[PDB]
Amino acid sequence: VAQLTIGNSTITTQEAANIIVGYGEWPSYCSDSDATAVDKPTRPDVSVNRFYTLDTKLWEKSSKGWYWKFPDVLTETGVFGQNAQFHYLYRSGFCIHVQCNASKFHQGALLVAVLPEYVIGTVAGGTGTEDSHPPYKQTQPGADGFELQHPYVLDAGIPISQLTVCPHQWINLRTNNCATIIVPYINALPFDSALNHCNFGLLVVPISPLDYDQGATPVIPITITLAPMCSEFAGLRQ
Amino acid sequence: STAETTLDSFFSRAGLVGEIDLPLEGTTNPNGYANWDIDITGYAQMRRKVELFTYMRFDAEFTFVACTPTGEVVPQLLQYMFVPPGAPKPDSRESLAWQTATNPSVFVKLSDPPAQVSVPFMSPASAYQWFYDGYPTFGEHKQEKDLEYGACPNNMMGTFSVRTVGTSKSKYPLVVRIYMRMKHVRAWIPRPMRNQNYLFKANPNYAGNSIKPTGASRTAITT
Amino acid sequence: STAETTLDSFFSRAGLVGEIDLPLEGTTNPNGYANWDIDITGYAQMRRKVELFTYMRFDAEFTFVACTPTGEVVPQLLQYMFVPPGAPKPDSRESLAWQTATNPSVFVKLSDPPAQVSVPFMSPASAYQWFYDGYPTFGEHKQEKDLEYGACPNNMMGTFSVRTVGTSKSKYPLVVRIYMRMKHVRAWIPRPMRNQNYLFKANPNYAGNSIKPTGASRTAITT
Amino acid sequence: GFPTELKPGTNQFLTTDDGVSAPILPNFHPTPCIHIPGEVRNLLELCQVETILEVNNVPTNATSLMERLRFPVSAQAGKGELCAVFRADPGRSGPWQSTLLGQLCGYYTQWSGSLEVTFMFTGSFMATGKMLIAYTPPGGPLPKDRATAMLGTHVIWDFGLQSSVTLVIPWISNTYTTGLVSIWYQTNYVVPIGAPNTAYIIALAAAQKNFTMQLCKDASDILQT
Amino acid sequence: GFPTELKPGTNQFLTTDDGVSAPILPNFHPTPCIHIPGEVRNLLELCQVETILEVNNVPTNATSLMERLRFPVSAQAGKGELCAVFRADPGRSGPWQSTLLGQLCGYYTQWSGSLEVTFMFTGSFMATGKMLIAYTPPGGPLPKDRATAMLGTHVIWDFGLQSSVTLVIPWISNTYTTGLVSIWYQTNYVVPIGAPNTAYIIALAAAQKNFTMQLCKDASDILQT
Amino acid sequence: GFPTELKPGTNQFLTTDDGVSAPILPNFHPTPCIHIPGEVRNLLELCQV
Amino acid sequence: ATAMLGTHVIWDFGLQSSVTLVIPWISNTYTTGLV
DSSP: OEEEEETTEEEEEOSSOOEEEGGGOOOOOTTSSSOOSSOOOOOOOSSSSSOEEOOOEEEOTTOOOEEEEETTTTTTSSHHHHHHHSOSEEEOOEEEEEEEOOOTTOEEEEEEEEEESOOOOOOSSSOOSSOOOOOHHHHSOTTSOEEOSOGGGTTTTOOGGGGGGSSEEEEETTTOSEEEEEEOOOOSSSSBOTTTBOOEEEEEEEEEEEEOOBTBOSOEEEEEEEEESSOEEEOOOO | OOTTSBHHHHHOSEEEEEEEEEOSSSSSSTTSEEEEEOOGGGSTTHHHHHTTEEEEEEEEEEEEEEEOTTOOOOSBEEEEEEEOTTSOOOSSTTOGGGGOTTSOEEEEESSSSOEEEEEOOOOSSSSEESOOOBOOSSOOSOOSOSTTTTOOSTTOOOEEEEEESSSSOOSSOEEEEEEEEEEEEEEEEEOOOOOSOOOOSSSOOOOSSOOOSOOOOSOSSOO | OOTTSBHHHHHOSEEEEEEEEEOSSSSSSTTSEEEEEOOGGGSTTHHHHHTTEEEEEEEEEEEEEEEOTTOBOOSOEEEEEEEOBTBOOOOSTTOGGGGOTTSOEEEEESSSSOEEEEEOOOOSSSSEESOOOSOOSOOOSSOSOSTTTTOOSTTOOOEEEEEESSSSOOSSOEEEEEEEEEEEEEEEEEOOOOOSOOOOSSSOOOOSSOOOSOOOOSOTTOO | OEEEEEOTTTTOOOTTOOOOOOBSOTTOOOOOOOOOSOEEOBTHHHHTSOEEOOSOOOOOSTTSGGGGGOEEEETTOOSSEEEEEOOSOTTSSSGGGGSHHHHHHTTBSOEEEEEEEEEEEOSOTTOBOEEEEEEEOTTSOOOSSHHHHHTSEEEEEETTSSSOOEEEEEEEOOOOOOOEEEEEESSOOBOOTTSOSEEEEEEEEEEOTTOEEOSBOOOOSOOOO | OEEEOOOTTTTOEETTOOOOOOBSOTTOOOOOOOOOSSEEOBTHHHHTSOEEOOSOOOOOSTTSGGGGGEEEEESSOOSSEEEEEOOSOTTSSSGGGGSHHHHHHTTBSOEEEEEEEEEEEOSOTTOBOEEEEEEEOTTSOOOSSHHHHHTSSEEEEETTSSSOEEEEEEEEOOOOOOOEEEEEESSOOBOOTTSOSEEEEEEEEEEOTTOEEOSBOOOOSOOOO | OOOEEEOTTTTOOOTTOOOOOOOSOTTOOOOOOOOOSOOOOOTHHHHTO | OTTTTSSEEOOOTTSSSOOOOOOOOOOOOOOOOOO
16 A cells, blocks of 8 residues: 655555556547647646545445546536636546445445446436436536436446446455546547537446445445546637 | 458448438428438438447448339439538529539439449548537537537538429429448447437437346246 | 649539520520520629639530420430531521531430530630730720720630421420539639629629628627 | 440449449548547457346346346355356347347347356455356256256356356357356355345356357347337 | 449439540640749638738728728727727638638638738827737637736737737637637827827738638629629 | 440340359358368269269 | 645545645744644
């Protein structure tokens, strides 16, 4: 076990941890992009690229699952939120670290997966004629994240049983307690809007329910820590 | 050999994508013309197929099989006009859109073999995308509503405007069936395959009465 | 890539340039034939485009799409005769111009695919010109009047004489639509683009009640 | 003046013909492609990705659908039989329909190769016990007891291993019975005080690199109602 | 005797097809081309030529049309706002319609690149003062005062410089709001006795060499009535 | 623009003609043939039996 | 949340007591730093 420190933020994680890099590609600055000279977009590395730790979630016997949208999850938090809100164009990678705190007498399994372009589809009651489109709070839930209504179909008509085709990692309370996923910038464009486009959604869903004998702590905390990799912002000001 | 499971082979074939009725009398297309926005999902099984991935690039080969509702071949001259993304479509049979040179037109006889043309990769982006988690830009400010969600506008591929040549209505009832074949397919970011019925064309909405893929089993122990 | 803004690409396409009515009965073309002077500006958007420059060279590919006013295809044989600049046009259906070998003729069935021919750079000059600041050649003496101003005669491109083959009137009402495509375009001396409506075909005259390009604004300060 | 004869097949339109056709916009230059991570070039890449196998395809109510992604191991049970994974054919109606493999077989007619089915135990750290996972080749009947199942191909799984049990199915083909996977209680479920008396197993399945599919065949659900 | 099959697309006439066709006059030899100065080969040559930008597109009577080619700077004004150059999109209806760039955009569908807008002061030699020319990127609102406009991209123009103030628009695209150019009074307009108390600025605009247009689209006014 | 004349025999269907025709399943790869004993290539092999 | 935006260590009980927060600087010239 060791001390991991970037910027002014310091977290406690384990040396003995297996990292999964999404699609085998590390996040990178877009020397890629044609638009240069003049001039290259502001890039914040030392200060903005720190450990942002979201308010933990409490996962219960009855929990269905949660999701967070990126970068929406941070466009209301720190200096990342400042840059994302007051710039025109944006692109970045992410280091997502999901960790549980449970005892050896608890049990359960979490599927932590990343789904690029995670579009939500809510209902009107089964079925038409015409549609309810989901509100802001369900499509861009902010740093609090939103809770899944129908996990089996991922709130979008697609089976969760195949979610492992996405960059994922299991949190088996018996085996591990943390999962780390690295996500590079994925888009049909080199730059996009930070506030109107969510490049991917993070999913943390119980496949095997939390269980414990009566007397053990009824709620097990899920702590999400995330850190921007290769941020890039273009534009000015308000 | 594994060439049958390449994306090119998976999408290779030409399928019916649109039917155009041009009746003598009726309410269908009274003005002897029709505008058909290019719809990849005109062919039923294609959407679920195509939605296995998030981003895609492809060419499209369009073939136009025309005849009367009996399958009869008649001496009629047709015009197939391709209205590119951003160009205005014809609103009448006398619209000047029909003679705009920047709208590629094909003039075929119903007697001739089926017409055939290729449409390049039209998107301004580097790839089409069947899923767009976000509201269309420009951003923000508020916006005004929720309605625009999940709609990517860079998937616009064009429009085919089908009419009979001439100033007078045709003497024949016509059906123009149009077929699309995907060439040079590339795709990115695999997704779980749709397991709930579709409800609407432009969003992943599902009935709140959701079903298993299958489940013909009483207990886990008996086969 | 910048190949879409080349002059060749800018003029590349084939547009409707003339329609020829050959009715059974009427006052239009009672003698079953028609003379059509090659008019670049038959296609509406073409004049302003072409007048972006002062001098131009180009080839022309002409395509002939024929049918009845209903778009019907009928068993009729047609003749497309190209009367070069300086040759006399036919004045009757029995004129000997129809059989002058130096007028290239095309004999097509309305059944056949559209006819197609290429016309070379016809001008005696080194370039066509859409603008000729001066009175036609040649000077002196006075000359006769003001009327000839702004007319260059070296832009004459030829004439297409369209008729139905035979000594008797055709049994079918016919329409001959002819399309022109510019090849090998070169141009010299760019000009400001026309911002006032056209009045006459052969001069830059404009309405004495002239209009802005645009103007949707109340004050310079409010967007 | 070049002599030519047109053969039969002239003028026909074959929907599977791979010719070239006239570009409608010759001067149009499509947006140049940039690099996007995660490109797939052959569907077999997706067949080799393990996805959740609904061995427990018995509950059908929309609120108990997640119960299908796992099956229970209980202290209440004796040394009997846990569950018989439906026959080892990915393309057949059953458990395999939840896997990406089974759904990609739905788009093809014939297939063949080796399979991997990895089981993951998600009980508490304090729980221990042994399971006997047996593979019965096609034609053979389901073994009547744990003893006769032990006589064939089998791995004995202990909860000294969390989930390193990945049973390998030797070979599958299409030319109706196919191989059976049966999971038996070797020992009873063992826990100390404070550990829950039921735990769930998640089964993940995929194809190996020698897996191939042949005749393409579009056949799915319902389009846009 | 050469075997051949005719494919679909036979006999069709595609108006954008670039085939070759039979010469109607094979023996005719066209007038040989001589050299003419000013040949243009690509329209982008013309897009890079600065033409007058009617920022002052407010008067409409046929005698005050020339007033659109420039906007006034006045002694009467305080330290407030001069004029907001309409959004930096050349192809949109507005001031840019007077430029050759904007008119050539009317013939295309998509465009992207950098812009140059050069302002020229045509007051008397004796007049001096300062202007603040600010660029607001798309999405951002028009700055509420000179101070908050100063916080962003801006050049402070002094009449120690006659007209080399050429504001550069970073990037423009087509995928409705776009970047704004706003001109503010930094200082009041200063003149000695004998110099006129109002002066006019002429705005010239053009595209830079990284500017490109894509999908051609014929659409203009009216032909020969 | 390639000059061509169609000769008599055009469009005819001769049942003994050995041309090649469009594959109906271009992407389909037939089962690779394994070795089978007893291959015959000429009927004269059977006449000598 | 807003405390996380500043200098902070996140202490887990994977560490018994290896958390030793360091106060950067203190002086005397009434408010001073808060933990």
